[PDB]
Amino acid sequence: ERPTFYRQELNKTIWEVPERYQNLSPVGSVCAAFDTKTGHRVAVKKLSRPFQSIIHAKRTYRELRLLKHMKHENVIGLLDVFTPARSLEEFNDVYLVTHLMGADLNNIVQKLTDDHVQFLIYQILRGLKYIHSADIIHRDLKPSNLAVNEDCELKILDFGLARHTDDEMTGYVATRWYRAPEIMLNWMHYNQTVDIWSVGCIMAELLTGRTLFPGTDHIDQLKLILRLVGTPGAELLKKISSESARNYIQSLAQMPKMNFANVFIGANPLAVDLLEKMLVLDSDKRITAAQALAHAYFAQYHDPDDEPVADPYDQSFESRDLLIDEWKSLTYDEVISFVPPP
Ligand SMILES: OCc1ccc(-n2cnc3ccccc32)cc1
Ligand SMILES: [Cl-]
Ligand SMILES: [Cl-]
Ligand SMILES: [Cl-]
Ligand SMILES: [Cl-]
Ligand SMILES: [Cl-]
Ligand SMILES: [Cl-]
Ligand SMILES: [Mg+2]
């Protein structure tokens, strides 16, 4: 049976939601609320103009499909999705409900012990093993996209939905400091290995308290990266598809890889070893999430019987060309078929 909905205007917005959600307060637009069915405090997000163009309609479908699939302790999941519409013909608004997140990793990064770093990076890799097993690439791992609570428990959120723009990646900005070099400069078709580069940048910052590669622009950032890991050899150069980018790289004086024990002074030698295996220029040769979970740095948390993988995830829609109203009808079907978690 359809729940009873009620309406209210919150900061120049009309919100129409089921009675179970109470005490809404602004925090798409997002409100915090109390969910009387589950007892949790929740975030309710009303999508802005979800079907205004073909690109926007497909992006709405993409986000709903991804959030419906993610069922893992270290990844954001969907508690509910609803529309006040009674039929496809009046369908216009989409609302998403998740657990309410408080601090991100920035709000926590306090004095962190090596034990804190072990536990935080372990949880990121445990969630990434799950995400990657479904052939999903996050693409935007950075401290503001990692929620952390008082007990140091962590969830990954804000998957890259192919959103970030040119102006957003320009200059002295944290939105670019965690990106792998091959995707920052469009060197090649990238894959899930780009996320492991991001984890290395995050781990380094937890150990030192400082951004690893705070470039003032794309080129300054590339120079910081190559000073640490060395300039590429002929093997990697072959894999860069742009003749232009290859010529630029060969314009630079050659540099050897630095000694990471003299960069991360005083760190656990096992942490230094893991960083050397994540921060490898050739993406083919980086450690994977599944391999990293078995590294000795995580010996006190690793449990191979409690590091689950995902159900298969069908992304064939990504190569499909549809009209606005066909993307809209697919989205409607996914809203009405939602089954809540236990
Ligand atoms: O777009 C999906 C989605 C992403 C993030 C969240 N979210 C959870 N807790 C929050 C607190 C503040 C702002 C957003 C929040 C909800 C939904
Ligand atoms: Cl209700
Ligand atoms: Cl509606
Ligand atoms: Cl898959
Ligand atoms: Cl950030
Ligand atoms: Cl040289
Ligand atoms: Cl699927
Ligand atoms: Mg974010």
mmCIF file of C-alpha atoms and ligand atoms in Angstrom:
data_model
loop_
_atom_site.group_PDB
_atom_site.id
_atom_site.type_symbol
_atom_site.label_atom_id
_atom_site.label_comp_id
_atom_site.label_asym_id
_atom_site.label_seq_id
_atom_site.Cartn_x
_atom_site.Cartn_y
_atom_site.Cartn_z
ATOM 1 C CA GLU A 1 0.000 0.000 0.000
ATOM 2 C CA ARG A 2 1.137 3.553 -0.771
ATOM 3 C CA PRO A 3 2.076 5.591 2.333
ATOM 4 C CA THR A 4 0.419 8.860 3.250
ATOM 5 C CA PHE A 5 2.482 11.876 2.148
ATOM 6 C CA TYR A 6 2.607 15.388 3.629
ATOM 7 C CA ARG A 7 3.887 18.667 2.158
ATOM 8 C CA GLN A 8 5.944 21.570 3.477
ATOM 9 C CA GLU A 9 8.137 24.388 2.160
ATOM 10 C CA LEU A 10 11.708 24.289 3.495
ATOM 11 C CA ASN A 11 14.011 27.108 2.310
ATOM 12 C CA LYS A 12 12.245 27.951 -0.963
ATOM 13 C CA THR A 13 11.617 24.253 -1.776
ATOM 14 C CA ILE A 14 8.448 22.138 -1.639
ATOM 15 C CA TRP A 15 9.039 18.741 -0.008
ATOM 16 C CA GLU A 16 6.379 16.013 -0.196
ATOM 17 C CA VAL A 17 7.438 12.947 1.828
ATOM 18 C CA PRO A 18 5.895 9.954 3.652
ATOM 19 C CA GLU A 19 4.681 10.473 7.235
ATOM 20 C CA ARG A 20 7.413 8.173 8.538
ATOM 21 C CA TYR A 21 9.969 10.984 7.984
ATOM 22 C CA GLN A 22 9.710 13.672 10.686
ATOM 23 C CA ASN A 23 11.445 16.851 11.879
ATOM 24 C CA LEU A 24 13.014 17.754 8.520
ATOM 25 C CA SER A 25 15.784 20.382 8.657
ATOM 26 C CA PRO A 26 18.020 21.625 5.807
ATOM 27 C CA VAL A 27 21.611 20.418 5.944
ATOM 28 C CA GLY A 28 19.951 18.253 -5.002
ATOM 29 C CA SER A 29 18.925 19.764 -1.684
ATOM 30 C CA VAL A 30 19.357 17.667 1.471
ATOM 31 C CA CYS A 31 17.465 17.575 4.791
ATOM 32 C CA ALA A 32 18.197 15.690 7.984
ATOM 33 C CA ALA A 33 15.203 13.795 9.378
ATOM 34 C CA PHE A 34 14.143 11.203 11.942
ATOM 35 C CA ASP A 35 12.874 7.943 10.402
ATOM 36 C CA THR A 36 10.141 6.547 12.654
ATOM 37 C CA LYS A 37 10.188 3.116 10.979
ATOM 38 C CA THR A 38 13.885 2.317 11.572
ATOM 39 C CA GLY A 39 14.742 4.694 14.429
ATOM 40 C CA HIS A 40 17.733 6.142 12.533
ATOM 41 C CA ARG A 41 18.542 9.724 11.762
ATOM 42 C CA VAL A 42 18.616 9.916 7.965
ATOM 43 C CA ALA A 43 19.522 12.197 5.074
ATOM 44 C CA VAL A 44 16.729 12.881 2.540
ATOM 45 C CA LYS A 45 17.910 14.248 -0.840
ATOM 46 C CA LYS A 46 15.481 15.729 -3.384
ATOM 47 C CA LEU A 47 16.996 15.564 -6.854
ATOM 48 C CA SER A 48 17.114 18.858 -8.756
ATOM 49 C CA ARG A 49 15.669 18.769 -12.306
ATOM 50 C CA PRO A 50 16.304 15.018 -12.734
ATOM 51 C CA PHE A 51 14.864 14.765 -16.289
ATOM 52 C CA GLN A 52 15.660 18.168 -17.846
ATOM 53 C CA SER A 53 17.831 16.718 -20.652
ATOM 54 C CA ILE A 54 18.889 13.366 -22.074
ATOM 55 C CA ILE A 55 22.217 13.670 -20.242
ATOM 56 C CA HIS A 56 20.500 14.565 -16.963
ATOM 57 C CA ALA A 57 17.873 11.821 -17.285
ATOM 58 C CA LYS A 58 20.535 9.169 -17.912
ATOM 59 C CA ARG A 59 22.594 10.490 -14.986
ATOM 60 C CA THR A 60 19.572 10.163 -12.676
ATOM 61 C CA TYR A 61 19.089 6.546 -13.783
ATOM 62 C CA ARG A 62 22.829 5.858 -13.359
ATOM 63 C CA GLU A 63 22.891 7.179 -9.781
ATOM 64 C CA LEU A 64 19.778 5.240 -8.754
ATOM 65 C CA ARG A 65 21.113 1.986 -10.246
ATOM 66 C CA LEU A 66 24.468 2.391 -8.462
ATOM 67 C CA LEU A 67 22.971 3.238 -5.056
ATOM 68 C CA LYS A 68 20.480 0.334 -5.282
ATOM 69 C CA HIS A 69 23.370 -2.097 -5.883
ATOM 70 C CA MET A 70 25.757 -1.073 -3.059
ATOM 71 C CA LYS A 71 25.261 -3.385 -0.009
ATOM 72 C CA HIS A 72 28.484 -3.278 2.074
ATOM 73 C CA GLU A 73 29.493 -2.022 5.546
ATOM 74 C CA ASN A 74 32.130 0.368 4.127
ATOM 75 C CA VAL A 75 30.017 1.860 1.271
ATOM 76 C CA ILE A 76 27.023 4.209 1.358
ATOM 77 C CA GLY A 77 23.758 2.316 0.824
ATOM 78 C CA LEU A 78 20.123 3.161 0.088
ATOM 79 C CA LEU A 79 17.567 2.991 2.916
ATOM 80 C CA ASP A 80 14.608 4.147 0.766
ATOM 81 C CA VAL A 81 13.662 5.820 -2.522
ATOM 82 C CA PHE A 82 10.252 7.367 -3.202
ATOM 83 C CA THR A 83 8.131 9.668 -5.384
ATOM 84 C CA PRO A 84 4.806 11.326 -4.510
ATOM 85 C CA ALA A 85 3.648 10.570 -8.083
ATOM 86 C CA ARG A 86 0.763 8.117 -8.395
ATOM 87 C CA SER A 87 1.487 7.231 -12.033
ATOM 88 C CA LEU A 88 4.205 7.393 -14.669
ATOM 89 C CA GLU A 89 2.292 10.239 -16.308
ATOM 90 C CA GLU A 90 2.684 12.580 -13.307
ATOM 91 C CA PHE A 91 6.180 11.319 -12.352
ATOM 92 C CA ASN A 92 8.528 14.276 -11.890
ATOM 93 C CA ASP A 93 10.392 14.165 -8.560
ATOM 94 C CA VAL A 94 12.793 11.608 -7.046
ATOM 95 C CA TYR A 95 13.856 11.439 -3.373
ATOM 96 C CA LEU A 96 16.746 9.340 -1.977
ATOM 97 C CA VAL A 97 17.205 8.310 1.690
ATOM 98 C CA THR A 98 20.481 7.224 3.376
ATOM 99 C CA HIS A 99 21.958 7.062 6.868
ATOM 100 C CA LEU A 100 22.875 10.566 8.036
ATOM 101 C CA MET A 101 26.626 11.186 7.770
ATOM 102 C CA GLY A 102 28.381 13.634 10.088
ATOM 103 C CA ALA A 103 32.114 14.184 9.780
ATOM 104 C CA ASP A 104 34.242 13.443 6.755
ATOM 105 C CA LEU A 105 37.905 12.473 6.906
ATOM 106 C CA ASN A 106 38.922 16.166 6.888
ATOM 107 C CA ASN A 107 36.938 16.816 10.076
ATOM 108 C CA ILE A 108 38.925 13.968 11.645
ATOM 109 C CA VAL A 109 42.247 14.955 10.015
ATOM 110 C CA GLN A 110 43.391 15.056 15.612
ATOM 111 C CA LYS A 111 46.625 13.189 16.327
ATOM 112 C CA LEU A 112 46.445 9.875 14.455
ATOM 113 C CA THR A 113 48.386 6.890 15.708
ATOM 114 C CA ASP A 114 49.715 4.297 13.280
ATOM 115 C CA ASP A 115 46.868 2.103 14.545
ATOM 116 C CA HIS A 116 44.356 4.717 13.365
ATOM 117 C CA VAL A 117 45.972 4.822 9.904
ATOM 118 C CA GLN A 118 45.914 1.015 9.654
ATOM 119 C CA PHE A 119 42.191 0.869 10.515
ATOM 120 C CA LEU A 120 41.105 3.736 8.246
ATOM 121 C CA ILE A 121 43.017 2.562 5.155
ATOM 122 C CA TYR A 122 41.949 -1.070 5.800
ATOM 123 C CA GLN A 123 38.287 -0.025 5.641
ATOM 124 C CA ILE A 124 38.819 1.972 2.417
ATOM 125 C CA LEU A 125 40.459 -1.055 0.756
ATOM 126 C CA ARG A 126 37.746 -3.434 2.050
ATOM 127 C CA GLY A 127 35.064 -1.254 0.445
ATOM 128 C CA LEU A 128 37.127 -0.882 -2.752
ATOM 129 C CA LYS A 129 37.561 -4.657 -3.115
ATOM 130 C CA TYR A 130 33.749 -4.874 -3.088
ATOM 131 C CA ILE A 131 33.243 -1.959 -5.531
ATOM 132 C CA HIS A 132 35.889 -3.215 -7.977
ATOM 133 C CA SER A 133 34.502 -6.785 -7.939
ATOM 134 C CA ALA A 134 31.377 -5.378 -9.630
ATOM 135 C CA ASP A 135 33.549 -3.684 -12.330
ATOM 136 C CA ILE A 136 32.694 -0.224 -10.927
ATOM 137 C CA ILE A 137 35.360 2.528 -10.835
ATOM 138 C CA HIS A 138 34.865 5.191 -8.152
ATOM 139 C CA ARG A 139 37.074 7.843 -9.898
ATOM 140 C CA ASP A 140 36.793 10.520 -7.151
ATOM 141 C CA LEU A 141 38.265 9.153 -3.914
ATOM 142 C CA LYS A 142 39.386 12.012 -1.644
ATOM 143 C CA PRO A 143 38.997 12.880 2.077
ATOM 144 C CA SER A 144 35.712 14.799 1.645
ATOM 145 C CA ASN A 145 34.119 11.662 0.109
ATOM 146 C CA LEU A 146 34.916 9.439 3.124
ATOM 147 C CA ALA A 147 32.504 9.601 6.080
ATOM 148 C CA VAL A 148 33.928 8.768 9.529
ATOM 149 C CA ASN A 149 32.203 8.489 12.923
ATOM 150 C CA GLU A 150 33.390 8.648 16.547
ATOM 151 C CA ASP A 151 34.439 4.968 16.562
ATOM 152 C CA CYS A 152 36.695 5.489 13.495
ATOM 153 C CA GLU A 153 34.252 3.561 11.266
ATOM 154 C CA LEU A 154 34.319 4.629 7.615
ATOM 155 C CA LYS A 155 32.037 4.642 4.543
ATOM 156 C CA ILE A 156 32.863 5.518 0.909
ATOM 157 C CA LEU A 157 30.398 7.866 -0.801
ATOM 158 C CA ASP A 158 29.929 10.237 -3.764
ATOM 159 C CA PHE A 159 30.869 7.982 -6.665
ATOM 160 C CA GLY A 160 32.085 9.757 -9.776
ATOM 161 C CA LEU A 161 29.029 9.890 -12.051
ATOM 162 C CA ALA A 162 31.059 11.459 -14.922
ATOM 163 C CA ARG A 163 30.219 14.876 -13.453
ATOM 164 C CA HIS A 164 33.298 16.986 -12.702
ATOM 165 C CA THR A 165 33.845 19.929 -15.050
ATOM 166 C CA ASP A 166 36.869 21.757 -16.460
ATOM 167 C CA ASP A 167 36.596 24.797 -14.180
ATOM 168 C CA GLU A 168 36.368 22.491 -11.152
ATOM 169 C CA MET A 169 39.766 20.852 -11.852
ATOM 170 C CA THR A 170 41.678 24.100 -12.507
ATOM 171 C CA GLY A 171 44.385 25.598 -10.307
ATOM 172 C CA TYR A 172 45.177 25.060 -6.608
ATOM 173 C CA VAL A 173 42.237 22.774 -5.787
ATOM 174 C CA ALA A 174 41.769 19.602 -3.725
ATOM 175 C CA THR A 175 39.435 18.265 -6.446
ATOM 176 C CA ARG A 176 42.559 17.330 -8.507
ATOM 177 C CA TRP A 177 45.244 16.533 -5.883
ATOM 178 C CA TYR A 178 44.141 12.875 -5.482
ATOM 179 C CA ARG A 179 43.730 12.010 -9.208
ATOM 180 C CA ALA A 180 45.974 9.516 -10.994
ATOM 181 C CA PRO A 181 48.293 11.156 -13.565
ATOM 182 C CA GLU A 182 46.982 9.117 -16.521
ATOM 183 C CA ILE A 183 43.434 10.449 -15.945
ATOM 184 C CA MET A 184 44.499 13.977 -14.951
ATOM 185 C CA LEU A 185 46.142 14.458 -18.366
ATOM 186 C CA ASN A 186 44.030 12.030 -20.467
ATOM 187 C CA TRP A 187 47.038 9.815 -21.225
ATOM 188 C CA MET A 188 45.095 6.630 -21.949
ATOM 189 C CA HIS A 189 41.942 4.636 -21.393
ATOM 190 C CA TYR A 190 41.946 4.254 -17.615
ATOM 191 C CA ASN A 191 40.638 1.473 -15.382
ATOM 192 C CA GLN A 192 40.034 0.660 -11.710
ATOM 193 C CA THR A 193 43.739 1.109 -10.873
ATOM 194 C CA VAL A 194 43.138 4.889 -10.722
ATOM 195 C CA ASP A 195 41.420 4.408 -7.350
ATOM 196 C CA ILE A 196 44.517 2.767 -5.801
ATOM 197 C CA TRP A 197 46.577 5.863 -6.701
ATOM 198 C CA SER A 198 44.007 7.922 -4.756
ATOM 199 C CA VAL A 199 44.270 5.622 -1.716
ATOM 200 C CA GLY A 200 48.044 6.116 -1.720
ATOM 201 C CA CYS A 201 47.637 9.904 -1.718
ATOM 202 C CA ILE A 202 45.141 9.660 1.173
ATOM 203 C CA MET A 203 47.378 7.308 3.218
ATOM 204 C CA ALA A 204 50.423 9.577 2.793
ATOM 205 C CA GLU A 205 48.389 12.551 4.065
ATOM 206 C CA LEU A 206 47.179 10.646 7.156
ATOM 207 C CA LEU A 207 50.802 9.746 7.987
ATOM 208 C CA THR A 208 52.312 13.247 7.494
ATOM 209 C CA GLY A 209 49.386 15.614 8.058
ATOM 210 C CA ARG A 210 50.189 17.257 4.678
ATOM 211 C CA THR A 211 48.802 16.985 1.127
ATOM 212 C CA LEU A 212 51.129 14.736 -0.913
ATOM 213 C CA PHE A 213 50.835 16.458 -4.345
ATOM 214 C CA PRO A 214 49.312 19.961 -3.828
ATOM 215 C CA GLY A 215 49.893 21.225 -7.358
ATOM 216 C CA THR A 216 49.014 24.789 -8.350
ATOM 217 C CA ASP A 217 47.857 23.494 -11.808
ATOM 218 C CA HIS A 218 47.957 20.242 -13.838
ATOM 219 C CA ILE A 219 51.610 20.720 -14.930
ATOM 220 C CA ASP A 220 52.938 21.750 -11.496
ATOM 221 C CA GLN A 221 51.188 18.682 -10.066
ATOM 222 C CA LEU A 222 52.743 16.379 -12.698
ATOM 223 C CA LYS A 223 56.192 17.746 -11.770
ATOM 224 C CA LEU A 224 55.585 17.002 -8.063
ATOM 225 C CA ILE A 225 54.495 13.451 -8.955
ATOM 226 C CA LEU A 226 57.479 12.690 -11.230
ATOM 227 C CA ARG A 227 59.963 14.035 -8.643
ATOM 228 C CA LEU A 228 58.731 11.385 -6.167
ATOM 229 C CA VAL A 229 58.154 8.338 -8.415
ATOM 230 C CA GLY A 230 60.583 9.108 -11.270
ATOM 231 C CA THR A 231 60.107 9.905 -14.951
ATOM 232 C CA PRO A 232 58.648 7.145 -17.163
ATOM 233 C CA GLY A 233 60.676 4.584 -19.057
ATOM 234 C CA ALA A 234 60.100 3.457 -22.631
ATOM 235 C CA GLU A 235 57.702 0.709 -21.520
ATOM 236 C CA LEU A 236 55.136 3.130 -20.081
ATOM 237 C CA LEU A 237 55.765 5.770 -22.773
ATOM 238 C CA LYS A 238 54.511 3.278 -25.376
ATOM 239 C CA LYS A 239 51.164 3.082 -23.556
ATOM 240 C CA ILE A 240 50.428 6.821 -23.770
ATOM 241 C CA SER A 241 48.179 7.205 -26.814
ATOM 242 C CA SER A 242 48.599 10.959 -27.329
ATOM 243 C CA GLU A 243 51.660 11.639 -29.467
ATOM 244 C CA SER A 244 51.461 15.156 -28.032
ATOM 245 C CA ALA A 245 51.599 14.024 -24.405
ATOM 246 C CA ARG A 246 54.477 11.656 -25.235
ATOM 247 C CA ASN A 247 56.465 14.550 -26.712
ATOM 248 C CA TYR A 248 55.809 16.657 -23.618
ATOM 249 C CA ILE A 249 57.014 13.914 -21.244
ATOM 250 C CA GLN A 250 60.199 13.388 -23.277
ATOM 251 C CA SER A 251 60.874 17.124 -22.962
ATOM 252 C CA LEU A 252 61.505 16.674 -19.223
ATOM 253 C CA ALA A 253 64.910 15.847 -17.756
ATOM 254 C CA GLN A 254 65.029 12.306 -16.451
ATOM 255 C CA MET A 255 64.684 11.749 -12.688
ATOM 256 C CA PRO A 256 65.032 8.595 -10.550
ATOM 257 C CA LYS A 257 62.473 7.341 -8.050
ATOM 258 C CA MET A 258 63.140 8.819 -4.583
ATOM 259 C CA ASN A 259 63.817 6.848 -1.372
ATOM 260 C CA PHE A 260 60.394 6.724 0.350
ATOM 261 C CA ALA A 261 61.959 6.092 3.783
ATOM 262 C CA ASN A 262 63.619 9.520 3.498
ATOM 263 C CA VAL A 263 60.302 11.122 2.428
ATOM 264 C CA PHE A 264 58.026 9.535 5.072
ATOM 265 C CA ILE A 265 60.502 9.947 7.913
ATOM 266 C CA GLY A 266 59.754 7.825 10.976
ATOM 267 C CA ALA A 267 56.799 5.944 9.487
ATOM 268 C CA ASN A 268 56.173 2.235 10.046
ATOM 269 C CA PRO A 269 58.424 0.441 7.507
ATOM 270 C CA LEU A 270 55.422 -1.683 6.511
ATOM 271 C CA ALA A 271 53.486 1.500 5.691
ATOM 272 C CA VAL A 272 56.405 2.770 3.578
ATOM 273 C CA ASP A 273 56.470 -0.559 1.725
ATOM 274 C CA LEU A 274 52.727 -0.414 0.953
ATOM 275 C CA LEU A 275 52.980 3.178 -0.296
ATOM 276 C CA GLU A 276 55.724 2.132 -2.732
ATOM 277 C CA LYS A 277 53.338 -0.506 -4.117
ATOM 278 C CA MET A 278 50.376 1.876 -4.542
ATOM 279 C CA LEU A 279 52.200 4.947 -5.918
ATOM 280 C CA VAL A 280 53.542 3.359 -9.117
ATOM 281 C CA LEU A 281 53.384 5.451 -12.296
ATOM 282 C CA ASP A 282 52.500 2.516 -14.611
ATOM 283 C CA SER A 283 48.927 1.631 -13.637
ATOM 284 C CA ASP A 284 49.398 -1.966 -14.887
ATOM 285 C CA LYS A 285 51.887 -2.527 -12.034
ATOM 286 C CA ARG A 286 50.038 -1.050 -9.026
ATOM 287 C CA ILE A 287 48.862 -3.341 -6.226
ATOM 288 C CA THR A 288 45.132 -4.209 -6.335
ATOM 289 C CA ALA A 289 42.680 -3.788 -3.447
ATOM 290 C CA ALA A 290 42.410 -7.567 -2.932
ATOM 291 C CA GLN A 291 46.218 -7.882 -2.890
ATOM 292 C CA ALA A 292 46.639 -4.918 -0.485
ATOM 293 C CA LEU A 293 44.244 -6.398 2.106
ATOM 294 C CA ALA A 294 46.716 -9.287 2.522
ATOM 295 C CA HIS A 295 49.730 -6.971 3.055
ATOM 296 C CA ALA A 296 51.463 -7.317 6.440
ATOM 297 C CA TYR A 297 50.585 -3.709 7.385
ATOM 298 C CA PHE A 298 46.978 -4.868 8.016
ATOM 299 C CA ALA A 299 47.846 -8.083 9.904
ATOM 300 C CA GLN A 300 45.762 -7.153 12.940
ATOM 301 C CA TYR A 301 42.552 -6.428 10.931
ATOM 302 C CA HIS A 302 42.726 -8.744 7.873
ATOM 303 C CA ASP A 303 40.061 -11.476 7.890
ATOM 304 C CA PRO A 304 39.742 -13.253 4.523
ATOM 305 C CA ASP A 305 36.372 -14.725 5.585
ATOM 306 C CA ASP A 306 34.901 -11.236 6.206
ATOM 307 C CA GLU A 307 35.983 -9.278 3.099
ATOM 308 C CA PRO A 308 33.000 -9.831 0.793
ATOM 309 C CA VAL A 309 32.592 -9.295 -2.941
ATOM 310 C CA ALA A 310 29.588 -7.872 -4.818
ATOM 311 C CA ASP A 311 26.789 -9.429 -6.828
ATOM 312 C CA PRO A 312 27.301 -8.939 -10.604
ATOM 313 C CA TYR A 313 26.403 -5.458 -11.900
ATOM 314 C CA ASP A 314 24.959 -5.050 -15.428
ATOM 315 C CA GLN A 315 26.108 -1.703 -16.912
ATOM 316 C CA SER A 316 24.981 -2.374 -20.485
ATOM 317 C CA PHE A 317 22.705 0.692 -20.294
ATOM 318 C CA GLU A 318 25.812 2.913 -20.494
ATOM 319 C CA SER A 319 26.215 2.166 -24.222
ATOM 320 C CA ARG A 320 22.474 2.537 -24.928
ATOM 321 C CA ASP A 321 20.906 5.525 -26.709
ATOM 322 C CA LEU A 322 17.408 6.417 -25.473
ATOM 323 C CA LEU A 323 14.941 9.316 -25.425
ATOM 324 C CA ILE A 324 14.312 11.425 -22.307
ATOM 325 C CA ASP A 325 11.001 9.705 -21.585
ATOM 326 C CA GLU A 326 12.541 6.233 -22.009
ATOM 327 C CA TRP A 327 15.231 7.055 -19.421
ATOM 328 C CA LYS A 328 12.445 8.468 -17.235
ATOM 329 C CA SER A 329 10.335 5.306 -17.518
ATOM 330 C CA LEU A 330 13.338 3.116 -16.635
ATOM 331 C CA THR A 331 13.918 5.296 -13.553
ATOM 332 C CA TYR A 332 10.247 5.004 -12.520
ATOM 333 C CA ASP A 333 10.462 1.194 -12.716
ATOM 334 C CA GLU A 334 13.498 1.212 -10.401
ATOM 335 C CA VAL A 335 11.761 3.470 -7.845
ATOM 336 C CA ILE A 336 8.663 1.275 -7.593
ATOM 337 C CA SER A 337 10.637 -2.011 -7.473
ATOM 338 C CA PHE A 338 12.833 -0.956 -4.508
ATOM 339 C CA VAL A 339 12.948 -3.469 -1.644
ATOM 340 C CA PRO A 340 14.289 -2.067 1.656
ATOM 341 C CA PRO A 341 17.087 -3.755 3.586
ATOM 342 C CA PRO A 342 16.217 -6.007 6.609
HETATM 343 O O1 LIG B 1 23.414 11.452 -3.750
HETATM 344 C C1 LIG B 1 23.353 10.385 -2.825
HETATM 345 C C2 LIG B 1 23.593 10.926 -1.427
HETATM 346 C C3 LIG B 1 24.877 11.357 -1.063
HETATM 347 C C4 LIG B 1 25.138 11.844 0.222
HETATM 348 C C5 LIG B 1 24.087 11.895 1.156
HETATM 349 N N1 LIG B 1 24.297 12.350 2.509
HETATM 350 C C6 LIG B 1 24.300 11.531 3.674
HETATM 351 N N2 LIG B 1 24.489 12.234 4.810
HETATM 352 C C7 LIG B 1 24.619 13.580 4.381
HETATM 353 C C8 LIG B 1 24.833 14.738 5.145
HETATM 354 C C9 LIG B 1 24.926 15.933 4.465
HETATM 355 C C10 LIG B 1 24.813 16.007 3.058
HETATM 356 C C11 LIG B 1 24.600 14.887 2.282
HETATM 357 C C12 LIG B 1 24.503 13.667 2.959
HETATM 358 C C13 LIG B 1 22.798 11.472 0.787
HETATM 359 C C14 LIG B 1 22.560 10.988 -0.498
HETATM 360 CL CL CL B 2 4.616 6.651 6.166
HETATM 361 CL CL CL B 3 6.372 13.475 -8.689
HETATM 362 CL CL CL B 4 30.293 -7.389 -12.922
HETATM 363 CL CL CL B 5 38.856 16.476 -0.171
HETATM 364 CL CL CL B 6 67.769 14.102 -18.955
HETATM 365 CL CL CL B 7 22.682 -5.821 -12.413
HETATM 366 MG MG MG B 8 31.606 14.836 -2.139
#
